[PDB]
């Protein structure tokens, strides 16, 4: 009986540790840098198909602006399944959504950083305002949208400058024009 109550707390504290971890990462200027450590293992879990995708911590356009996050598939998704690294942008249900203009219509720039500050993998896009990926969130997260063929799985395989110390850095820049 008392064994149950103890697990209860241990679980609740696990959640709090998660929340604090989340806050440690959120930004409010639309610029986000995501660090993915233990890459090799995560890359494996994706190839093996046990964990196809990973969500990044949430970030914002402003203190009370849109809530967003990124989603990556270390072994590709859709048209890039198995051949590319697929990177997507996600519009999340924010606390202040009622005060914001919809649909989300800010330009987004996604990047896989070269840890030798040389050739960064970059791609950008403007939202398709009719897409359900940019409608006001009804659930926790809208359908991710972005780049299925972001970067060839070879560009970050073996000896390359994107993977260093078994970690990669993804960067997102949300244009704040008009807000």
């Amino acid at each position: 009986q008392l064994e149950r109550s103890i697990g209860l707390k241990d679980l609740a504290m696990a959640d709090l540790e998660q929340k604090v971890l989340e806050m440690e990462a959120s930004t409010y200027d639309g610029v986000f840098i995501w660090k993915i450590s233990d890459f090799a293992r995560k890359r494996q879990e994706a190839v093996a198909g046990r964990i196809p995708a990973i969500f990044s911590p949430a970030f914002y356009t402003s203190r009370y602006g849109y809530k967003m996050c990124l989603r990556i598939y270390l072994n590709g998704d859709g048209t890039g399944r198995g051949t590319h690294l697929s990177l997507f942008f996600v519009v999340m249900k924010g606390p202040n959504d009622a005060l914001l203009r919809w649909p989300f219509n800010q330009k987004v720039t996604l990047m896989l950083l070269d840890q030798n500050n040389r050739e960064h993998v970059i791609d950008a896009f403007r939202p398709d305002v009719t897409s359900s990926s940019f409608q006001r969130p009804v659930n926790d997260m809208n359908i991710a949208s972005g780049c299925p063929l972001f970067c060839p799985v070879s560009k970050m395989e073996a000896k390359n400058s994107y993977v260093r110390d078994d970690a990669i850095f993804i960067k997102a820049i949300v244009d704040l024009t008009g807000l």
Binding site: F88, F125, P127, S145, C147
Partner: peptide, 6 residues
């Protein structure tokens, strides 16, 4: 143009 995840 953004492409949705599958």
């Amino acid at each position: 143009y953004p492409i949705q995840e599958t």
